[PDB]
DNA sequence: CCGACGTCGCATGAGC
DNA sequence: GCTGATGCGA
DNA sequence: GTCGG
């Protein structure tokens, strides 16, 4: 709903969920935070007080409290002091880099580096992984408009074949559930000549072709079976040149693939709620396989996996479309 | 009262 | 130089 | 910070 209903309290609880992960480095903190903020963002009514929100799951005692504090004062008294707080505002600005979580920012501004300058006059100090993140701060926070990871998409299947005909690629995320934007880009990869019960090369020569044509600009990180990096549409002509996008490229062997699929795609509501209906079924369902339980709890073997449906199969749920996996 | 809160590949440091 | 923990991102 | 065993 508007953003106008109750904008300002999940953005202050937004905020307080940055300076958990960021600041007092308390990750289960900050998701409370955001688990808060989210179900009072879906919340269609102005909240009139503490107590109103308390109802809902996921808003406490402390919240409760904090939303009263809002309500009658405009505010948050700790909020407004974090803020000022020029050391803490600094390594929670950090953060937002790429490859410098809360212990390098936190160890940045011990040693006076507080800004992006700052992370600039001192290249030495830095891994691969933030100069990359430096070099791309702006473009990173960019959303990538749907047109655009059609764009990428069709260069990305494209290369992929022709390397090898027999691979398949899939583009998930909520790109493949058909949002009109996406924060980047998450290839999943398999072979029919890779499987769990059996070369290190697969992912990297498609990784070279895409390297190869010039769509591939930067690598974060790389490995056998998992690859991080940069990409870039070829700019068309004197048009203005395309901001720089995060892609993940990982490979999954072939009987685990679509259960890999199912997971990337999301939500992640509707992965809570898919994986708690099989368990009221009698089998468990995870990133790689799913698998029965059990009269005990005992798991067996991981069922055979071919289409995304078989799974939906199993635990006799109709297919539903990636457009229709919002919760 | 008090533990769970996802899990893991890769890069990198520490430990030895 | 080898083993394993840590930081990071997703 | 919140939930729940
Ligand atoms: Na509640
Ligand atoms: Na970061």
Redesign the pocket.
């Known amino acids: 709903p508007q953003e106008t209903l109750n904008g300002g309290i999940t953005d202050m609880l937004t905020e307080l969920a940055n300076f958990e992960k960021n600041v007092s480095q308390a990750i ?2 900050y ?3 955001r688990k ?1 903020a989210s179900v009072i963002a879906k919340y269609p009514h102005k909240i009139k007080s503490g107590a109103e929100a308390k109802k809902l ?8 409290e904090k939303i009263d504090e809002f309500l009658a004062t405009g505010k948050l008294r700790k909020l407004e002091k974090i803020r000022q707080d020029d050391t803490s505002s600094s390594i929670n600005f950090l ?1 937002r ?9 936190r160890k940045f501004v011990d040693e006076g580096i507080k800004t992006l300058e700052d992370l600039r006059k001192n290249e030495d100090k830095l ?3 933030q100069r990359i ?1 430096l070099k791309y701060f702006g473009d990173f926070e960019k959303r990538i408009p749907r047109e655009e990871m059609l764009q990428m998409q069709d260069i990305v299947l494209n290369e992929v074949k022709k390397v090898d005909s027999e691979y398949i690629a899939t583009v998930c995320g909520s790109f493949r559930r058909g949002a009109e934007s996406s924060g ?1 880009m ?1 290839v999943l990869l398999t072979h029919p000549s890779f499987t769990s019960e059996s070369q290190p090369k697969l992912l990297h020569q498609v990784v070279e072709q895409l390297q190869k044509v010039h769509f591939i600009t930067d690598t974060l ?6 690859f ?1 990096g940069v990409c870039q549409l070829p700019s068309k002509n004197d048009e203005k040149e395309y901001p720089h996008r ?1 892609i ?1 490229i990982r490979l999954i062997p072939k009987d685990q693939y679509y259960c890999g699929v199912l997971y990337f795609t999301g939500s992640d509501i509707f992965n809570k709620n898919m994986r708690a209906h099989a368990l009221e079924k009698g089998f468990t369902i995870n ?1 790689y396989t799913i698998r029965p339980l059990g009269v005990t709890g005992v798991a067996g073997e991981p069922l055979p996996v071919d289409s995304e449906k078989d799974i939906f199969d199993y635990i006799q749920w109709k297919y539903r479309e990636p457009k229709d996996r919002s919760e």
């Open positions: 289960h903190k998701n409370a935070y808060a799951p996921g808003v406490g005692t402390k919240i409760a953060t880099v790429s490859g410098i979580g809360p212990s390098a920012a891994n691969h992984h993140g980047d998450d990180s790389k490995g056998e079976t998992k991080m995060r993940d990133e």
